[PDB]
Design a protein around this ligand. Sequence first.
Ligand SMILES: [Zn+2]
Length: 81
Amino acid sequence: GSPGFTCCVPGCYNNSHRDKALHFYTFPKDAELRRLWLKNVSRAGVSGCFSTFQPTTGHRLCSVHFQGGRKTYTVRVPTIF
Ligand SMILES: [Zn+2]
């Protein structure tokens, strides 16, 4: 696929540009909640508003973020960092 975008992982599974070979979850059905995730996923290049990993091709998230599994307990948005 793309040259990267394996979840801007500051510490979770694999990150938005250093693996691309593990599992990724997809974006909810509700547009906004989606943009909310946009946040947890990274942002304007995490420094400059270049455009890389543009969340158009379909940005998905990596494993080790939710607790237990299937989203529950309290964590809804994959931000664990
Ligand atoms: Zn991740």
